[PDB]
C-alpha cells in the first residue's frame with residue numbers, strides 16, 4: 001500500500017480533471033522491467049484545501065471493494081501525495097464507445113448500464129454521493145466489464161440528512177446536474193440517479209458530437225446565451241419539462257428509464273436497485289433469456 005516514488009517509472013499522461021491528473025506508470029522496484037503498470041492520480045496544483053479533499057477521496061476509494069469500482073492499490077508520499085490505482089487498458093467508456101460504435105450493440109450497452117447501476121448501488125450502501133456520473137468517468141477493464149473510475153467529487157452524506165449541499169468553485173458539469181443541484185447545490189442518491197439517466201442517454205447516442213448533452217441543451221436554450229445566463233436558462237428549461245430527446249435507434253423502454261431518472265420530483269426518481277432489475281429484465285427479453 002506504500003509505493004516509493006523512486007520506483008514509479010512514468011509511461012504516459014492518461015487524462016486531466018479540473019484539479020487532479022492521471023498518468024500511466026510502471027512500478028518497477030527491481031528495475032528489471034517486470035513491475036506492474038499502475039494508474040497514478042496526482043494534484044495538478046498542490047494547495048491545502050485540494051490536499052485535504054484528495055486525502056478524503058483516497059479514504060473513500062480505499063473503503064470501496066466492488067467489481068465495478070476501480071481498485072485502490074496504495075499511496076505515494078514524496079506532501080506530494082499520489083493515489084495508486086489498478087491500470088485499466090481500454091480507457092474511458094466515452095472513448096471506447098466512440099471507437100467501437102459499429103461493433104457495440106444495445107444488449108452490450110445494457111450490460112455496461114447494469115454494471116454502472118450495481119457499482120452505484122454499492123456507493124449508496126456506504127452513503128457516498130458520486131456527484132460526477134458521466135461516461136468520461138467510467139473506465140473499461142475489458143469488452144465485458146466497466147468500472148466507476150474516479151471519485152474526485154464524491155461526498156459522504158451527513159448521518160442525519162439524505163442530501164449534501166456543496167458549491168465547488170470553478171466550472172461544474174451542469175448538463176449532467178439534477179435541477180435541485182443547479183438551484184440549491186443539493187446532492188443526493190436521487191441527483192446521482194438523474195446523472196445516471198444522462199449517462200444512459202450518452203451511451204445510446206454512441207457519443208455523437210452533435211448529440212452530446214451540452215450540444216442538445218445549448219440548442220434548446222439558444223447558442224446566443226452568455227455564461228451565468230446558461231445556468232438560469234437551463235433551470236427554466238428543466239422546470240418546464242424540457243428534456244434531452246430520445247437518441248436515434250433508442251427503444252422506447254430505454255428512453256422511458258431515462259425520462260423517469262429525469263423527474264423534477266426528487267422522491268419520484270427510481271432507485272439504483274430498481275434500475276438494475278429493469279435493465280436486466282430488458283437485457284433478458286432482448287436475449288430471449
Ligand SMILES: CCn1c(C(=O)N(C2CC2)C2CC2)cc2c3c(ncn3C)c(Nc3nc(C)c(C)s3)nc21
Pocket residue numbers: 014015016017020021022039070085086087088089090091092136137138139149150152
Ligand atoms: C480517461 C483517462 N483516465 C483517467 C482520467 O483521466 N480520469 C480523470 C480524473 C482525471 C478518470 C476517469 C475519470 C483515469 C484513468 C485510468 C485508466 N486506468 C486506470 N485508471 C484509474 C485509464 N487507462 C487508459 N488506458 C489507455 C490506453 C488510455 C488512453 S486511458 N485511463 C484513465
